[PDB]
């Protein structure tokens, strides 16, 4: 717009929450599909669904992590990461079934004198590799689901050797996308790159993806949010620089079925 | 309207340029790939394109019978102390690597399944006795149905289950199967569990395998040699060829870069270094 | 048939050859006889010795191909990798092509680094009691550490402490010294046996002693 | 363009070569005349001309020179500078006559903390002054034509005194444009200024200029490219800074007549 409007400057508003950004590289809509409610033609569960709307379909800001020369990368799972977030987590646990889209806004600012590139990826059914070489598909429910704090990637695969009392957890190696495939190709998946010299953040609008119209949000995680350093953090001359990466996410057009007593998971 | 076998777009004649338009310049950060073509960065001539993407289409890419398993059965001498060996195989595309890697280029899939059975037999003992032409019985046992415990027990009656009675030496057996998934599409990957570990309830109880849905997805293939025990022992092998027809696929993924290690995405130590040595400035 | 002997150390520095012998039986002789080498190796999908008519270098600039090519033989071909850095393993393969059945062969690989150097130094003056006279067996330059062994002539040997590995350029270094206590004579063929399993017989270095006053 | 388009960002494409620039001060077209082929009404040599087109009418990048606090300036001559450039030099030497225009792109980037101004000038018939005070118009063919590496200007006129064995070469003094006239006035000639704080480079589109419709490219140089420091290079505090000046040039609407055996000049 000769009037002023621009790709880099956006304003997102959901329920009682609003996000502003003066340095964005536009925004991405996974597979060109904007989140939507379950249609009658595609519906399964016959009971009147619970649609929290503004109470849950708003912006939740998770615990801010620190990016450094040493960082190999971070990972999160949806809905798992939002499981303890206000009215959204409450409605998710009270219902047998649930479906939801997301507006993922990854925030990470610095300075015209800093360097680095964060590869922000949205992966459908992001199944990760375990820490065991004597057994398989053994990663425990508690460890597979870190909740809000999420997990992290490792530059090296080090097998759990304690056969007696197994760590029973994931060993996601960075260059292999934590799942047996080459990172260089992760780009076939809905994503955006946070290149310090070009932009403050990454905005990904994710639709409800799955082999089913609606499923068990507590048993199954539809989307995986992977953040890896394509180009290592670097500043002026400081040998050990640091910058925060804040992750804010908002559930969308989300709905729930099969209402009963609240589900109290064994998360530890 | 555009057909898989339609000729790709013709290359258009392009001359010199001194403008404010910058096709060559862009910003991968946005998540998008520059839709550029030869004529955007260099002077091109007019070319009538005849080439097609016919053979690279989803159906064309998989339109080939692939080996998913090798079943071993036999027919010993009545006297032998050891039991007549009848085969029981849990149906799947993961026992072998080739077809699995191809299907795995994608998250979800949908398709009518064509199963072709190649049967080969042979003599095991430096004997000299012979054996009359064998007749195999390939029975499909769906999850819940009485799984056979003996090469000749009541279950082989197949009153309800689908059975194929194959005759040795004849054209390899073949049958078609519809999209039988309890879901709207097959899940090449399941980022979750079949059970929810409830605090209030004993640890061991709420436990289950990672990435594993229905303990018994599609039941099993129970194969046996219908013929009675023969003085001279004859061992047979049943090779199962699986071909995905009328197929559809969703959400693309990066191909399996390192040696498969079990039914899940798990990798194993010593196999994580696929790429070979090659210098930055060497052609 | 395939009869490749290549399980080779392989000496570093370097340089040595990486051979491939395929002795041919014998009344059903083989063509076309092009020879391919695939590394092991981030192979997607090249660091290749291929030889159709003229020998083609698939780009690993540090290669030498020595076979009677552009004509034919056929292939008991030898390759060479220099150099001279430890572009190691991993592994290497050697696959041939044939008009009869033989578009096939075998993967065959091995070792890597190598070898150290040694000298003996003996001092100083004996003011006892009751340690060093002193014989030192220095071992410079060998990443897989050379098993230095100090022995001598008598039961005055059980006394053999080591300098561990504070590694030089890619390569590990050590020094075993003795100690051997006190008192007088010159005079014995105290022999340090440094191995590593390369070269010929292990580095046997015999010396004397500093006797004073 | 409210759509994005701008004076500073350009993309030039000739044959198999393309040049991009995000920091340009627009572009200059000598005397408002865009290069063109020889018209029938103005033609002289009756034989069917040789028009190399894309084979020669493309971008050749000459040897990159270094700009420093000490630099007095650099000079080149056309076509001389391109005489050894691929198919263009080959066609120039095989023919008695030849005519050609040029797209001159002078590249020189730095930083928001650097200072300096490069005066880039396109001079028709750029006749330069010799090194001798005892004789005149004596500068040898070999010295008058440096080829791709070009020549350089001097802050001081120092006469060749070796009467016996004369250097027989040019003594171009900076403030006198190497030719008896005041530099301050060189601006009456087609030009652009590379002011570090404003732009990365200078783009000059030169037409075939001359008293004749077509001439001897080997005997005569139509254009002279003079680059002098109007304002001296300067950085932060470094006492001896340095930045490269890369010169890329492309022949245009060029054509040749009088074909015969190749001309092998005595260039040394
Ligand atoms: C007499 C022969 C009868 C043959 C009966 C075959 C019926 C069973 C076919 C099951 C098809 C399974 C195909 C692969 C599905 C997997 O990808 C699942 N884990 C994904 O949902």
mmCIF file of C-alpha atoms and ligand atoms in Angstrom, chain A residues 211, chain B residues 91-94 103 107 109 111 113 115 117 138-143 161-165 175-183 185-189 211 213-214 217-221 242, ligand 1:
data_model
loop_
_atom_site.group_PDB
_atom_site.id
_atom_site.type_symbol
_atom_site.label_atom_id
_atom_site.label_comp_id
_atom_site.label_asym_id
_atom_site.label_seq_id
_atom_site.Cartn_x
_atom_site.Cartn_y
_atom_site.Cartn_z
ATOM 1 C CA UNK A 211 -6.183 -39.933 9.187
ATOM 2 C CA UNK B 91 0.200 -58.824 7.480
ATOM 3 C CA UNK B 92 2.329 -55.688 6.888
ATOM 4 C CA UNK B 93 4.594 -53.644 4.561
ATOM 5 C CA UNK B 94 7.405 -53.224 7.135
ATOM 6 C CA UNK B 103 5.128 -45.492 0.916
ATOM 7 C CA UNK B 107 2.336 -39.386 6.118
ATOM 8 C CA UNK B 109 -2.257 -43.101 2.325
ATOM 9 C CA UNK B 111 -5.693 -47.653 -1.614
ATOM 10 C CA UNK B 113 -4.617 -53.645 -2.384
ATOM 11 C CA UNK B 115 -1.866 -59.383 -3.451
ATOM 12 C CA UNK B 117 1.368 -65.135 -4.520
ATOM 13 C CA UNK B 138 -3.802 -69.549 2.024
ATOM 14 C CA UNK B 139 -6.315 -68.540 4.725
ATOM 15 C CA UNK B 140 -6.963 -64.925 5.754
ATOM 16 C CA UNK B 141 -7.536 -64.671 9.537
ATOM 17 C CA UNK B 142 -8.905 -61.237 10.572
ATOM 18 C CA UNK B 143 -8.351 -59.840 14.106
ATOM 19 C CA UNK B 161 -12.873 -66.329 6.446
ATOM 20 C CA UNK B 162 -11.493 -65.888 2.886
ATOM 21 C CA UNK B 163 -9.258 -68.756 1.697
ATOM 22 C CA UNK B 164 -7.230 -69.245 -1.497
ATOM 23 C CA UNK B 165 -6.660 -72.845 -2.649
ATOM 24 C CA UNK B 175 -6.629 -61.485 -5.188
ATOM 25 C CA UNK B 176 -7.847 -57.903 -4.692
ATOM 26 C CA UNK B 177 -8.661 -56.130 -1.392
ATOM 27 C CA UNK B 178 -10.523 -52.829 -0.804
ATOM 28 C CA UNK B 179 -9.497 -49.909 1.431
ATOM 29 C CA UNK B 180 -10.079 -51.783 4.746
ATOM 30 C CA UNK B 181 -8.802 -49.192 7.269
ATOM 31 C CA UNK B 182 -10.882 -48.354 10.397
ATOM 32 C CA UNK B 183 -9.752 -44.763 9.661
ATOM 33 C CA UNK B 185 -6.833 -43.207 5.548
ATOM 34 C CA UNK B 186 -3.854 -45.495 6.348
ATOM 35 C CA UNK B 187 -1.404 -43.925 8.853
ATOM 36 C CA UNK B 188 2.260 -44.451 7.782
ATOM 37 C CA UNK B 189 2.936 -42.625 11.088
ATOM 38 C CA UNK B 211 3.770 -44.917 17.701
ATOM 39 C CA UNK B 213 -2.126 -48.036 17.317
ATOM 40 C CA UNK B 214 -4.288 -51.205 16.969
ATOM 41 C CA UNK B 217 -4.059 -53.646 12.536
ATOM 42 C CA UNK B 218 -5.079 -56.191 9.857
ATOM 43 C CA UNK B 219 -5.009 -59.770 11.196
ATOM 44 C CA UNK B 220 -2.827 -62.523 9.669
ATOM 45 C CA UNK B 221 -2.123 -64.822 6.707
ATOM 46 C CA UNK B 242 2.009 -56.370 -2.669
HETATM 47 C C1 LIG E 1 -7.022 -64.712 0.917
HETATM 48 C C2 LIG E 1 -6.186 -63.435 1.051
HETATM 49 C C3 LIG E 1 -6.907 -62.332 1.825
HETATM 50 C C4 LIG E 1 -6.029 -61.105 2.087
HETATM 51 C C5 LIG E 1 -6.567 -60.228 3.219
HETATM 52 C C6 LIG E 1 -5.834 -58.893 3.353
HETATM 53 C C7 LIG E 1 -6.596 -57.884 4.219
HETATM 54 C C8 LIG E 1 -5.680 -57.040 5.104
HETATM 55 C C9 LIG E 1 -5.035 -55.871 4.355
HETATM 56 C C10 LIG E 1 -4.466 -54.804 5.293
HETATM 57 C C11 LIG E 1 -3.777 -53.662 4.547
HETATM 58 C C12 LIG E 1 -2.620 -53.041 5.335
HETATM 59 C C13 LIG E 1 -1.805 -52.046 4.509
HETATM 60 C C14 LIG E 1 -0.836 -51.217 5.349
HETATM 61 C C15 LIG E 1 -1.522 -50.438 6.476
HETATM 62 C C16 LIG E 1 -0.521 -49.823 7.457
HETATM 63 O O1 LIG E 1 0.166 -48.787 6.769
HETATM 64 C C17 LIG E 1 -1.173 -49.268 8.725
HETATM 65 N N1 LIG E 1 -0.237 -49.386 9.858
HETATM 66 C C18 LIG E 1 -1.536 -47.807 8.501
HETATM 67 O O2 LIG E 1 -2.780 -47.476 8.864
#
